[PDB]
Each structure stands twice: as C-alpha cells, then as structure tokens.
Design a protein around this nucleic acid. Structure first.
Ligand SMILES: [Zn+2]
Lengths: 136, 52, 66, 177, 76, 116
RNA sequence: GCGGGGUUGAGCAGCCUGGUAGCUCGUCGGGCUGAAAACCCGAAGAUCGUCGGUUCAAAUCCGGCCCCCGCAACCA
RNA sequence: UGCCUGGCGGCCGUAGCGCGGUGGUCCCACCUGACCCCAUGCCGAACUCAGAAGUGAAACGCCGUAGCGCCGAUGGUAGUGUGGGGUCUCCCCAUGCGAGAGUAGGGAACUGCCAGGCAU
RNA sequence: CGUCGUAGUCCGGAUUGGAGUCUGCAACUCGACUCCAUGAAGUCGGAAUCGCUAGUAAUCGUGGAUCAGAAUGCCACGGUG
RNA sequence: UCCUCCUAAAGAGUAACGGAGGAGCACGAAGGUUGGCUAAUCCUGGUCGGACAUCAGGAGGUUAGUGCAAUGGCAUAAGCCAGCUUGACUGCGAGCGUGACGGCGCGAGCAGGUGCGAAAGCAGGUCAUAGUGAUCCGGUGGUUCUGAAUGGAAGGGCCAUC
RNA sequence: CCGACUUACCAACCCGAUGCAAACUGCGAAUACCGGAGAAUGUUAUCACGGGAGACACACGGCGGGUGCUAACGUCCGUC
C-alpha cells in the first residue's frame, strides 16, 4: 500500500476536485487505463488493482503506476462530537480528474492487456476506458 | 529577565538622569557615557547609580 | 613587513661536512655547521643500490657447487 | 635571491625551449609558499600553541597567523572561533630564501628519505608536501624542544596544468625520485 | 488541541497607488522587507516603510539589474 | 576581479550622490595615468574632464603617475569647472582609498577653488 | 482524555540546564575449605523503550508512537 | 567623419555563460622596486608609493559560432465577470476578458556625453 | 684498578631478521650452541601462601645418570655464609 | 495577552475546541559612523589527521548567514572583520497609517549640542514584525509652581522614574 | 596487509520522460480595490455637526472555502 515516507505537514484541507487532468497520454508503456469519471482513488484501491493486473498478466512485461496517493484524508473517532480539533489520518488518496491515465502496461499482448485492465478496473470506484500509445 | 534596570546620573551636579538596563552578572564594572544634559545644554559625563 | 613583531633575521654562513659552504639568511644568529648538504647527500649514488632485492638462486650457487 | 635570479635566466630558457611558449609571461612561476601547522591538542592546552608559533617563527622569519576554526565540528570537539592552527604565507624574497634553505638543508636531513612523491600536484599544478619531524630545520634546538611536532609545506605556482608545475619544480633539481 | 493561537493583522499593503496626488510625509506602502525600494523623493523608514518627501503623484516603476520595484514621487 | 571589487566598493556612494542629486567629481586612477571628470546630477553627461593623457597637461610633468601629477590634474579640473561656473560639487573617490594620489587631487582642487 | 515511568542480566539512582554512566545483587578469574556455601582480592559490562526534528553534538530539548502505573469516565 | 581604448550613464539576459580566433604606436592589464606616504589579526597577495626592462600568457575588450541559459507569436486549452440551464461533489449555453506550459521562430545587444591614440 | 651515577639505564635478556658450527641417513613442523643486528614486559609484586633452628637458610659455580645429539629438571660436590 | 504562515475568495479586514510553530527575553556591544571582506556544500593534494579541525587550488553562486520561531527582505549587503565613539541625545514636528475609544506605529524637516568621515552625508537604538499591564495608592530626585492670617514647612502640582 | 570476481539485492548526485501541494512559485488572469478626466441620469442620493433610537440569537438559496462522512433543514466566515 503506497504512502509518502515523510510529509511537510500531517493534515491537509479537504479541497475541491475541479479542472481537467495532466497525464492524458500513454508515456512509458504501450497500453494504459484512462479515467473518464472524477473522484479520488485510495491507496487500498490502488494496491488491489495492481495485484489484480499483475496476477492477470502472470508477472510478465512491465507495469507503471502514474498515480500516487499523497493527500491525507482524516476522520473523527467513533461517537465523538463535532468540535475538539481535526481527526486523525486514516488513509491516503490521490485526486483524480477526467482523462488521467492511472496505469500503464507493455510486454504482453493486446487482448491480455484488455482482460487485465478490465479485472483491475472492476475494483475501482471511478469509470475507466482502455487507451493505447499514440505517436506524437 | 536577569537584566535589571539602572539610572545614569549626570556629573554636572544637576539632578538629571537617564535610565537603561544592564546585566550585573557579566558586567560588574560601572557604566560611564557622555549624554546631553538639558539643564546646562551641554553633553556631560553620566555615571551609573543605584535605581533605588 | 611590520617593525617589531618578527624574529631577528639576518645573514649567516653554513659550512657543510663536504666543504660546500653556503651563505644564507636565517634566524640562528650564530654560524652553522652542516653534516649533509644537497650536493653531498647520496641521492645520486647511494639511493640506487638501496633496493636490496636479494637473490635466492645466485646465493644458493655461491654457498656450494656440484 | 640566488634561486630567484637562477629562475630568471636558466628556468625561463629551459621552459621556453621545452614547452615552445610564445610569450615569456606564459612560463610558470611560484607565487606563494604557505606553511601550515594544525595543532589539534591546543583546545586542551594553550601553553603548547604559543610554542608552535615560536618554532614556526624560528623556521620562517615571520610571526605566524593564529588561525581559527571556520565551522563548529563535534567529531574533534571544537566550537567556532577556537584557535587550532598556525600558518605563514611566504611571498617574493622571503619565499625564495626559505625555498633555497629548505631544498639545500632541510630535505637531506629527513629520516630515511628516499625521494618525494610526484603524485601530490592537486591536478592544477599546486604542490603540497608534509614533513614528519620539525628537527630537520636547523633553526630549532634539538635538546631544548619539548615535543616533536610536524608541519606541511604548500608550494603554490601559477601553472595551469599538472606537468608544467612538475617541470618547473624539476628545473630547480627537486629530489623527486 | 494545540493550534488555537494567532496574531492580530498588521494592515499592510499599498496605501497610495500609482498616479495619486499625495502630500509630503504620507505613507505609500507598509511592508515587512524591502519588497519595494525607495526611488527619487521617497525615503525608507525604520520598519522599511516608503514615505513621500515632497508633494506630487506616486510613480511605480521596475528598475535595476535585479528587476526591483521602485517607488518615486513624480514632480507636481 | 579587482575591477569588479572596485566597482562594488564605489556603487554605494554613487547611488547616494545620485539620490541627493549632487553633481559629482569622479576620479579614475590607473598605475600610469589618472583621470578626473565632473558629471551632472542625472549621471548621463559630463561637464568638465581633465586627465594626464591630455598632451597639454602631460608635457609639463616628468611622470604622469605620481602625486605631483595628481595635484596638477586636480588643480586643472578645478580651474575648468570654476571657468564654467560649476563650483559646488561632491567628491566621488570611486572605490579607491582616500589617501595618496586621490587625497592629493582632492586637496589640490580644494585649494584651487572647488568646494567639497 | 490527564500526570508519572522505560537506564549493564534483575531492582534502582543520576539524566540538568546538551560534551561526564553510578549503587546493590548477579557474572568472570584467582584465594580460603578435603569439597560446596559464607568471606577476601582483581576485573568487566549499557545504542539510557521506538522513530522523526533543532544543534557542531541528543540518554538530556521538541513532536509522534508502543508498553507499564495511578486519576477520571458523572447529571440524566 | 571612420576604427580602437578608457571613464560615467540609459536599459536589465534578444543584454548572460561556453567554444575558437585576435589586440599593444596610444589606452588598459599583468609587470619592476619598496628607506619613505600607507598596510597585512602573518605575507607590498589586497591596500599604498616610486617607475617602464618585458608580455598580451592570465584577466579585459572585439570578432565568429546556436552546445545552453533567455525572449516568443498565431491558433487551441484552463480559469472567470454578468444572465440562464443540467444528470448539480461537478459542468454546459449567450457574451466580454483570456493565461501558464509548449510549437514555428528570434537571438552572440542597442544607445547618449567626454577624453586619448591612429587615418582622412 | 677503571667506567657507568638512579635513567626502562652500559640493568634485563624475551622476540625477530641475516650468516654459521656440531651430532645424526635426515635439525621445516621439532635439537643444542655461536657471530652481527634487534632490546617486549619488568622499577620488589593484591587476596593469599611456602621452605628453613647451623655450616641450616640465602647465594656462587663444578660433576654425573639418561644420551648419537639434546636440561633452567633430577641425583651428588665444594666456596662465602 | 502578544508575534509568523495558511484558512483569507490576487487592495484592507475576516470566524471555529481549524491546520502548524514561538514570545513574557538578550546586547555598554550584538548600537552609530568610516574603511575593508564574501559564504553553504562538494572534488583534488597534504604530518600526526580519521567521513568531518587547520592549509593550497578548483567547481558552485547565497541552496549560507541574520542573538531567537516563521514570513517578507538583504551583494550598495541588513551577513562577516577592524579603528574611533554614545544619535540607546533634549524640546518639537509638516503629513499620514491603524484603532469604537484608551491607545499603538511611520516620519522628512526646525533649534541647541554631539559622534564618525577629507567631504557629500549618516545617526532620535538593534534587518522589520513578539519580548507585555491602563488607572488608583505609595516611594526617590529635581523645580518657590502652589502653600487656608502672614513667613516658612507639611501636603498637593509639574518634570524624570520606581 | 592488499585484495578476487559476479549478484533476478538496495541506492546518493546528474541526465531524459510523468504526476501532486492551503502553509511550494523562475509564470499568471477574470473580478474586486484606490486615484484622475469626460458625458448622461438620480427629489444631495455624499460628507460634517447636534436631538432620539433600535440592534449586538439571525435563517435559507447561488458562488469561494474551513470543519464533518466532498453526511445533515449540521456548523463557522466572505459576498449577493
Ligand atoms: Zn655536503
């Protein structure tokens, strides 16, 4: 489960998730899984998807992960009132905007990549699509 | 706040005095400066004395 | 240089063991007698044979013969 | 003065012909000789730092500069501003006199001396060599010294490359190997 | 928690903007460092405050090799 | 490097003179020659300029790079300024120490009539 | 949720204004006894609970964490 | 009025580095010497004085060069003031403003006053 | 008789390098001795403990058995005491 | 109670038991002026010397430093070194900033006298922002200002201060 | 003492490519705010002084957010 080794500050504001994404194109591999929706991917979701797609491709080829969960999400303990300061960090997320390529993969066939990305996408909250590397 | 305050009495014989602070543990020697004395309108030597 | 902060420094005469006399300026004040100079030290003739590598077979042959 | 004029005629001719220099000023020359004496033990005792200053003044006829720690370091338990060394800078006439005195008296008296090292030229023609005992300088009195110290000589020259500085030092019959 | 403290606002910022006619001695900007540097007819106070020394209109300009912002008082 | 250090030394007093809007007398000192000029408060145009490379001032001197030469050029620049009505200026040492040749030029200009 | 604590194998001092680690029992090697205790002599030992941070330097100072001991968890 | 050099600016990288070449009649720099003026927490290195035997080697100036730094459109994108709408965590429509990054490209500065040297 | 003058020393000889002698078919593991160079620890010894009542203790050499060579051990012998 | 950043929506201001840290001091030089200087870190060479002491050269260009937290500054250095000194003066202040107010803050310049510098000039504390307590009552020094018939005095006022 | 090679191991600095930041900025709007000039419109709508107040529990909706579960007809600000 990916999480930052160190951080400048422990807690971070809730924020907003407006705008479009930056990593629109497949940069390293030959196939990518692009998000068409909007939301936040937790570390557990990223780990589960990575395990699913690695097992699916039987540890062949190479796999990149273009996202990293760096936003700390807090929540208050069970049965406490609304004040008394901010809650304790429980998990980490990565804000996702539409068009963001989450994972990349090469070294395996096309249809095998299709099946691996489908199995991976089946464990994610946001809606995804399959994209291939394009010249220029 | 180990730095305690003192007064600099004029040497001109007038009762005029300035006031400041000093660290009596590391500077035991008395303070002497030339300051303006507005009664005689001249810069005279002021000597450190007990604040009382 | 400053006037008085420095040590006394003037001309002397140094005479080597090999008779090579040199006139130089130093702080000794009195004259000086050298036991080895640069022109007499064995770094041209003595320091060649100093390796003392040694031979085992020539030495063996020297001790006895057949 | 002897090595100075010796340089001004013989060394300049030798370098001009063996390096094919176009200008006389391109020929390397020695600018300064620094004499450092790192006294780490001075933190424990001040009575042995003025002694080191005295014998350095005896060796080269200048009152040395009592250097101080640039930055605090715990590994040697010193704080910034502590005096831990003494140095001397030699330029011009005094530099030439000390150079001739060293090359003709000091180095032949080094115990088990078998030649210096030609691999101490710092890659930019500035040679630096260290002596193990200060008794090689006849200015000091052997019986009246209290502890055997040591120093390090640094010969700073204007030579850009490494072979130019080596050739310049060799032209004065330096005892390399 | 241990995060309840804060300090009172210092009311900094530019008090007279460019092309404004001001009287001598009036504060132009209250700053912390020397974000704006004093030009002609503008002095720098104890806390780096730039103040007009003569009546006129405020002039902002970028000058120097370091691209520093200077404030001067144009003649009027 | 030395020239850069000298410019760095002078560039504080030059800004102060400009801020005070004073017409300044700049002196430039080289080993063989010495130069002097009085520059207007805007700093972009000079008013009078005297220097030892000028033949008219050079031919009366044994060597152009000594104290007497400095005194001569200082007196010359002072006379030219007074002739043109400029009499109240500020002296700009231009990074050199106010001693020797620069001090010689300054007191010569002072006794010659200039005010600084 | 709040105060105190974590130190040679065990029980414990001192962490003092951050440069410096001490006691008893225990342990090791000789001595006494025929032998084992008791006794005598000489030795040794610690990364001061974990991890970040400010210093030239943290067992000491700061913040988070784990364990142990008390205190409180009431009006309905 | 043409070239070169020095001083003070305007402007603050299209003006700055790097590579190669080039400059000494004058100027500038390194250079020679240090009782004196003055100076080194030691040192004529710096600072200072008295000078011209040598060299443009270093530095500095000039010229050439796109390996960088730097500037940079047009068009598109993001954001947004006003009014309206939706599937309302976020978007879309009418209208006005319109980036940043990147692309083609530009680019080895330009200019004012004074003085000196060489030619007209 | 001379020298050393309270020192790690002209005390002490360990350790190590080079060159040898003798015995024995054969001195590497693993003999004794010699020459040159080297000169550790040691400055009278904690708790404790041993021998000795007269030619004894202490101290200084000499011989023998074993044995081709190989004792600071053992068994004897005398000198001072 | 006070200071620094964010929350704070590109002038100012702006709340929560919101997110993070500090202050209740220090300095007779660590202040003023004149003159001078440039770090951090790394590479190479060098006696003890070691990853790290001091020396020489190079790369680098402020990633360093500021008496202390953070932010904004700083090469003309506000950072570092040396000489001389008390402007850490007295009475004032055109004109502004920020406050409901009490108040707090910036300020050229005038008069007297002073320090540094040859001089133009700079200096009314410290690179700036925390380092703090209104009033009453009482203490000390100065000043005929006042002084209950008059002359004093006590007490009170004013100035400096606890 | 020097060292000897290679080992499905980790990895500083630098170079190329790709993201993230409220407490990061070599860039950077729309708005908003201050000032100057002009015309039209508005029952001076603006400011100063004096007499009298009330109010200092706010609510929801849009936009920008903190906190909460990007929960609440939740809570706290800015603006309409
Ligand atoms: Zn000789």
């Amino acid at each position: 489960m990916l999480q930052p080794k160190r951080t400048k500050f422990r807690k971070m504001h809730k924020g907003r998730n407006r705008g479009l994404a930056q990593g629109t194109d497949v940069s390293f591999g030959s196939f990518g899984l692009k998000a068409v929706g909007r939301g936040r991917l937790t570390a557990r979701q990223i780990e589960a998807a990575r395990r699913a797609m690695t097992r699916a491709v039987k540890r062949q080829g190479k796999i990149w992960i273009r996202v990293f969960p760096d936003k700390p999400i807090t929540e208050k303990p069970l049965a406490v009132r609304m004040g008394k300061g901010k809650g304790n960090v429980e998990y980490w997320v990565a804000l996702i905007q539409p068009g963001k390529v989450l994972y990349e993969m090469d070294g395996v066939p096309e249809e095998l990549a299709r099946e691996a990305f489908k199995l991976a996408a089946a464990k994610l909250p946001i809606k995804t699509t399959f994209v291939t590397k394009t010249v220029m | 706040g180990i730095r305690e305050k003192i007064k600099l009495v004029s040497s001109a014989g007038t009762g005029h005095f300035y006031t400041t602070t000093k660290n009596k543990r590391t500077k035991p020697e008395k303070l002497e400066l030339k300051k303006f004395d507005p009664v005689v309108r001249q810069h005279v030597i002021y000597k450190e004395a007990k604040i009382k | 240089m400053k006037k008085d902060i420095h040590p006394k420094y003037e001309e002397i005469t140094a005479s080597c063991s090999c008779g090579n006399v040199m006139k130089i300026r130093s702080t000794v004040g009195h004259d000086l007698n050298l036991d080895v100079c640069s022109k007499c030290h064995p770094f041209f003739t003595g320091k060649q044979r100093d390796v003392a590598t040694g031979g085992r077979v020539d030495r063996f042959n020297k001790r006895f013969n057949i | 003065a002897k090595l100075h004029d010796y340089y001004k005629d013989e060394v300049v001719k030798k370098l001009m012909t063996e390096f094919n220099y176009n200008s006389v000023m391109q020929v390397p020359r020695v600018e300064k000789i620094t004499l450092n004496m790192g006294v780490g033990e001075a933190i424990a005792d001040k009575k042995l730092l003025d002694n080191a200053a005295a014998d350095l003044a005896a060796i080269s006829g200048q009152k040395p500069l009592i250097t101080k720690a640039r930055k605090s370091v715990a590994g040697f338990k010193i704080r910034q501003g502590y005096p831990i060394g003494c140095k001397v800078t030699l330029r011009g006439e005094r530099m030439w006199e000390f150079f001739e005195r060293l090359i003709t008296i000091a180095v032949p008296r080094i115990r088990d001396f078998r030649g210096l090292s030609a691999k101490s030229f710092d890659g930019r023609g500035n040679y630096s060599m260290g002596v193990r005992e200060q008794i090689i300088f006849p200015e000091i009195d052997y019986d009246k010294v209290d502890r055997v110290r040591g120093l390090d000589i640094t010969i700073t020259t204007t030579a850009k490359s490494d072979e130019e500085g080596r050739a310049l030092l060799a032209a004065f019959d330096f005892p390399f190997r | 928690t241990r995060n309840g403290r804060d300090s009172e606002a210092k009311r900094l910022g530019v008090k007279r903007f460019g092309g404004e006619s001001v009287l001598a001695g009036s504060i132009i900007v209250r700053q912390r460092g020397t974000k704006f540097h004093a030009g002609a007819n503008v002095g720098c106070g104890r806390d780096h405050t730039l103040f007009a020394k003569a009546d006129g209109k405020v002039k902002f300009e970028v000058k120097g090799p370091k691209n520093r912002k200077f404030i001067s008082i144009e003649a009027e | 490097d030395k020239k850069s250090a000298r410019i760095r030394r002078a560039t504080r007093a030059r800004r102060k003179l400009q801020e005070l809007g004073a017409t300044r007398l700049v002196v430039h000192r080289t080993p063989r020659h010495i130069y002097a000029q009085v520059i207007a408060p805007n700093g972009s145009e000079v008013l009078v300029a005297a220097s030892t490379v000028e033949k008219a001032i050079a031919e009366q001197l044994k060597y152009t790079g000594n104290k007497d030469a400095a005194a001569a050029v200082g007196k010359a620049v002072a006379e030219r300024a007074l002739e043109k009505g400029i009499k109240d200026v500020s002296f700009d040492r231009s990074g050199f120490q106010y001693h020797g040749r620069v001090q010689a030029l300054a007191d010569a200009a002072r006794e010659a009539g200039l005010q600084f």
